[PDB]
Design a protein around this ligand. Structure first.
Ligand SMILES: O=S(O)c1ccccc1-c1ccccc1O
Length: 344
């Protein structure tokens, strides 16, 4: 059987199972989305498509645009190096030092931080979701400033390009695939240039990109990776029709991912290498961006704690008017598959 697929720059068992041969052994092959069919990463408009990535796009698709296209198979938390970075030689060493300083943020984050979404509800799926992705910077800045007893009104917001948030349709369509290596090349080099421009004092970085940025000689004012309130819930989705029409196939898919997750615990280097190649980053940056022993936490989850994390992100979207009505997570989830896999 052949399924189309994609994954965000996050640790996940779908990519692991595919590159390690577990899917092949299960008689399943995956074809990554080309740049020309890349919008599916945000719309889920395909009959046999599966994605393991950030939760914002699927929450918007299910809760705002097209209820019913997907089912949730599992969750894998994400937490690692994260925060507003400054150059090592910067006199800024504490959160309080950000008072009155120039914070570089995406146009999307600026809409959210100002509480002025503009034409948000009238935008097409791709551009609309990109506005919501400004949430990462927005929440991170609020939490960072809290440490210095400051608020957003205490700093200067300056527009800059942020990876994953600023992705023009032309850029997407020109990319060979939606793999991080093709869509997000040399991110840290670009962020280091922004910090060297003389027009900004700090900017948001995370994922392996933050690891490479740190290597250029930069540091986070506050490492948000040290506090769980900055974690996100990566989600694994699949076309709803496959769940209803081909449960046997979905079960084989989930079994393979679970086996790959167990296997990963004893093959840390191989797992680090395959994620690094998929995203186009150094192997050392993977560990910094996802956490030292992320390979021990790759078996997908649907327990109460994992669902609460996903709900937390959803609430940030609702509070900030990026969603009007919430997605019923218990209905969206199809726990039977993961439950059967873990009972083997
Ligand atoms: O998928 S998102 O949640 C996501 C999460 C984290 C980093 C990048 C993206 C992303 C943004 C735009 C287009 C493709 C992407 O993978």
């Amino acid at each position: 059987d052949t399924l189309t697929y994609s994954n965000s720059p996050v640790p996940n068992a779908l990519l692991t199972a595919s590159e390690s041969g577990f899917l092949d052994a299960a008689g399943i092959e995956l074809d990554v989305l080309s740049g020309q069919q890349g919008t599916v990463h945000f719309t889920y408009d395909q009959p046999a498509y599966t994605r393991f990535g950030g939760e914002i796009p699927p929450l918007l698709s299910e809760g705002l645009r097209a209820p019913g296209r997907t089912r949730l198979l599992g969750i894998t938390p994400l937490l690692g190096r994260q925060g507003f970075f400054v150059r090592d030689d910067s006199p800024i060493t504490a959160a309080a030092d950000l008072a009155g300083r120039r914070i570089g943020v995406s146009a999307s984050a600026i809409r959210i931080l100002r509480g002025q979404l503009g034409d948000y509800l009238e935008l097409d799926p791709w551009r609309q979701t990109l506005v919501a992705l400004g949430s990462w910077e927005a929440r991170a800045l609020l939490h960072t400033l809290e440490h210095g007893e400051l608020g957003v009104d205490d700093v200067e917001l300056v527009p800059i390009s942020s990876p994953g948030v600023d992705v023009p349709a032309e850029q997407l369509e020109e990319s060979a695939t939606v793999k991080g290596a093709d869509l997000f090349p040399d991110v840290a080099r670009g962020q280091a240039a922004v910090l060297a421009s003389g027009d900004v004092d700090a900017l948001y970085s995370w994922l392996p990109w933050a690891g490479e940025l740190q290597a250029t000689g930069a540091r986070p004012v506050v490492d948000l990776g040290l506090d769980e309130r900055n974690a996100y819930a990566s989600v694994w989705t699949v076309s709803s029709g496959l769940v209803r029409q081909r449960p046997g196939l979905v079960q084989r898919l989930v079994d393979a991912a679970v086996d790959a997750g167990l296997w990963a615990r004893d093959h840390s280097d191989a797992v680090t290498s395959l994620h690094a190649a998929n995203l186009g980053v150094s192997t050392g940056a993977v560990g910094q961006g996802f956490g030292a022993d992320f390979q021990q936490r790759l078996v997908p989850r649907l327990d109460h704690d994992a669902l609460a994390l996903l709900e937390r992100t959803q609430q940030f979207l609702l509070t900030n008017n990026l969603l009007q009505e919430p997605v019923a997570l218990d209905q969206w989830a199809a726990p039977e598959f993961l439950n059967n896999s873990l009972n083997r």
